[PDB]
Amino acid sequence: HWGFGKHNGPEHWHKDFPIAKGERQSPVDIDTHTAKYDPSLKPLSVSYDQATSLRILNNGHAFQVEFDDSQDKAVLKGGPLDGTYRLIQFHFHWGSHDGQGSEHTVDKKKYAAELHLVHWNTKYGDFGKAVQQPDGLAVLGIFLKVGSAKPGLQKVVDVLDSIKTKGKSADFTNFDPRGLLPESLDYWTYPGSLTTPPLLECVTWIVLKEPISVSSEQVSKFRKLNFNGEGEPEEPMVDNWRPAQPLKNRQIKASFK
Numbered sequence: 001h002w003g004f005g006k007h008n009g010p011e012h013w014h015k016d017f018p019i020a021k022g023e024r025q026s027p028v029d030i031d032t033h034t035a036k037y038d039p040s041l042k043p044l045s046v047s048y049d050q051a052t053s054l055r056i057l058n059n060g061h062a063f064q065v066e067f068d069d070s071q072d073k074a075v076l077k078g079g080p081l082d083g084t085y086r087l088i089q090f091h092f093h094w095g096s097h098d099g100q101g102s103e104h105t106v107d108k109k110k111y112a113a114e115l116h117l118v119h120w121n122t123k124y125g126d127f128g129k130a131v132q133q134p135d136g137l138a139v140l141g142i143f144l145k146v147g148s149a150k151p152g153l154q155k156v157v158d159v160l161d162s163i164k165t166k167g168k169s170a171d172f173t174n175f176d177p178r179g180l181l182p183e184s185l186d187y188w189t190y191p192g193s194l195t196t197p198p199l200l201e202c203v204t205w206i207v208l209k210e211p212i213s214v215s216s217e218q219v220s221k222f223r224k225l226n227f228n229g230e231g232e233p234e235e236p237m238v239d240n241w242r243p244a245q246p247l248k249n250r251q252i253k254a255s256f257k
């Protein structure tokens with residue numbers, strides 16, 4: 001029942017998901033002057049060489065690329081994390097125009113879109129068990145801003161026409177998510193939550209300081225997706241981002257100065 005409409009959007013989610021008003025909700029605004037640089041925080045370790053993509057799906061609020069998470073070398077570790085996290089999927093959030101769309105903000109600045117690479121902690125055996133624990137998931141977030149085209153994104157954007165409506169899926173093998181990473185792995189990190197229902201507080205967030213550049217045409221293809229199923233009345237898929245939530249009693253740390 002939840003969505004991004006006026007009557008079922010993020011302001012309403014707390015009615016079915018009371019955790020929406022909890023102590024560790026995401027996304028948040030990152031205040032770059034108050035983020036505390038921790039020089040002990042280690043480098044991220046992103047090993048995607050063996051990442052095995054499967055399919056891409058329009059799920060009615062976004063599109064999602066799924067991975068074979070039995071590949072045990074397809075791993076996020078290091079940085080702020082204990083143990084190993086397996087890549088399961090990635091997806092984006094975007095706006096009705098270039099001037100908004102990201103979920104995290106930086107000094108209140110909104111980016112055109114935000115990529116989320118979602119990984120689960122192998123110590124919990126599978127994703128469903130993981131989301132019930134405070135250290136169950138690690139999500140790597142990457143801002144997109146408009147400029148030069150990102151070559152590694154092109155296979156994703158070109159396939160969207162074939163999954164315009166809810167439920168539509170397409171084989172999506174041999175996609176390398178390394179083509180979506182910026183040069184720098186400098187990041188901010190904090191404990192938070194899923195940003196769609198069920199909004200479980202099970203995520204170590206790792207948000208990269210450096211945005212990737214994508215072309216105007218590239219992000220505009222995102223907005224040609226539709227929330228609706230085929231036959232139903234066209235509802236373009238835009239503004240599928242949850243806004244900043246109260247920081248409450250948490251500290252955002254930075255891996256850099």
Ligand SMILES: [Cl-]
Nearest residue numbers: 157217218221
């Ligand atoms: Cl394009």
Ligand SMILES: [Zn+2]
Nearest residue numbers: 091092116195
């Ligand atoms: Zn997300």
